[PDB]
A = this chain, B = another copy of it.
């Protein structure tokens, strides 16, 4: 039995930037008041986890990364009311405290208890539940899912359907919900519209899924890797373009293709140049562009504000704009009811011990989502 006891288990520790993950024994403290200890079942490899490795996304090291996952509650601390031992759960990398001005706002989801703005790499109480070789190890986004066990704050976990297939619904913990919500909730794509989606990885494909669900008439996928185009068309792209194939800048190409600009554009890569290109390619008077890609740490973009003065709307969002704890159980229920598909995102399924091979597949351009299984 493990309740109230330290667990020794396997985790993938990132000791410093630009190094492989180290698969080794860590110690996981039992949950304190209002905390939940979770036995991991499956976790996806999101490009944001690779950003921690590359130093694109700064968070304290050493760290247990991973934020797109699903598992089963092993134990609960004093005062937990929302999950019980045995429940299937998805960790919420964007918390939902329910009390802050953002949580109370009808359109806010970036709860002020998040650990993304100004990463501390701890639990809400400012301490860590992880040690490895006698050293404290940081948390990541209040989740830390690259471990056989994690501890999360109650506001960073949602109970989901007991019959959920965790090897699929782990993607509702980040990439699916982010892309789909960026289209249906943040952009509010309209029926009959023309969309452009920059980046055709797991999140961009999920944007396409949402644009198609919203009834877009045209969905133009944009990627420098033409190997991504077949799956983009399978999930709803009506055409795909590779900027490398053109002499003109792709914003000009997309403006011409759309007879004067697209209705909705999405940046789903993480580059300053594509953020500005994606804004520019939406119609100057009524176009909307959504930034989804995480930008490189501390770098500013350059743009001409006449792009906005003519009437464009530019916005961004975390986790597709979804209030995380309200939305994740409903998204799982919708998946169970066949309202959307997850299999198109899953290209590889590997044991957790093959985490580095999973990251190599992402970096090589050869995977969409690898699901790691514990």
Contacts and interface: CB of A to CB of B under 8 A. Distances in A.
A79 to B, nearest CB: 27
A303 interface: yes
A258 B259 CA distance: 43
Contacts of A300: 302-305
Interface string A305-334: 110111111111110010000000000000
A7 interface: no
Contacts of A167: none
A110 B310 CA distance: 6
Counting chain B CB atoms within 10 Å of each CB, the highest count among A299, A300, A318 belongs to A300
Interface in A269-285: 272, 275, 283-285
Contact of A108 (B272, B286, B304, B318): B286
Given A109-B285, A110-B285, A275-B305, A316 B321 contact: no
A283 B315 CA distance: 13
A291 B284 CA distance: 14
A108 B312 CA distance: 10
A318 to B, nearest CB: 7
A313 B311 contact: no
Interface of A: 101-102, 105, 107-110, 112, 117, 259-260, 272, 275, 283-286, 291-292, 294-295, 298-306, 308-318, 321
Please list the 7 inter-chain residue pairs (A to B) with the smallest Cβ-Cβ separation, ordered nearest first.
Answer: A308-B316, A110-B285, A309-B316, A108-B286, A108-B285, A313-B315, A102-B285
